Design a protein around this ligand. Structure first.
Ligand SMILES: CC(C)c1cc(Cn2cnc3c(Cl)nc(N)nc32)on1
Ligand SMILES: CC(C)c1cc(Cn2cnc3c(Cl)nc(N)nc32)on1
Length: 209
């Protein structure tokens, strides 16, 4: 079963702005996704201090960056807390409404798209480089889900039948045809050292076979 949902109007407007605005400094998407992964790793680590069983789904706390030339994808994998079905459909978007409005107003007052993370909605910077984003996620005591959207005002959620992940999130960026530089090892290394060099979890940049 695939369920299709409409974005909140403000989120759809944000996605259109990210897709349509002329803005050359697209590389900031990676720092935003790595920051989200780091936040998710912080959360599971904190919760494990009072409930060690929360790591029964995996003790390693890390971030992997995986390019695929065959699929034209860059995947950001973390073993953080993961997202529930309710997170994916309702709750993260409810939280994001506030930051979206503030970000859009800041842009009209002279802010820049690279500041998106200061409003807590940096996930959507993925659409600077991706025509479609697939999110595979697994939270303890919920199922493994695939969320997906090519924008246009809707997203889907389904139970995921792929390789079980244990716990965490994979953000699969289906890159636009002109954004394949983000598959290059040298380019990702440059961006990670520029914007994400103090993240408190190991970041492994996989190499393409
Ligand atoms: C899927 C769309 C709707 C989305 C993604 C985000 C950012 N985000 C919130 N919780 C997260 C966790 Cl637990 N892990 C990671 N990696 N990112 C997270 O917010 N909305
Ligand atoms: C694991 C948790 C603490 C977390 C928080 C974030 C920040 N963040 C980035 N983009 C977001 C969107 Cl679009 N929505 C919402 N609600 N939060 C977003 O990322 N992960």
């Amino acid at each position: 079963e695939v369920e299709t949902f409409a974005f909140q109007a403000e989120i759809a407007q944000l996605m259109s702005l990210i897709i349509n605005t002329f803005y050359s400094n697209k590389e900031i998407f990676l720092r935003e996704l790595i920051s989200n992964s780091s936040d998710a790793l912080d959360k599971i680590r904190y919760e494990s201090l009072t409930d060690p069983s929360k790591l029964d789904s995996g003790k390693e706390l890390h971030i992997n960056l995986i390019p695929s030339k065959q699929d034209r994808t860059l995947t950001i994998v973390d073993t953080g807390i993961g997202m529930t079905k309710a997170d994916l459909i309702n709750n993260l978007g409810t939280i994001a409404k506030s930051g979206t409005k503030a970000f859009m107003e800041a842009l009209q007052a002279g802010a820049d798209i690279s500041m998106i993370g200061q409003f807590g909605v940096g996930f959507y910077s993925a659409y600077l480089v991706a025509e479609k984003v697939t999110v595979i996620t697994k939270h303890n005591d919920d199922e493994q889900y695939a969320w997906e959207s090519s924008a246009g005002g809707s997203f889907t959620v389904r139970t995921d039948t792929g390789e079980p992940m244990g716990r965490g999130t994979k953000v699969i960026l289906h890159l636009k045809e002109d954004q394949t530089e983000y598959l290059e090892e040298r380019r990702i290394k440059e961006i990670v050292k520029k914007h994400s060099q103090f993240i408190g979890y190991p970041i492994t940049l996989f190499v393409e076979k």
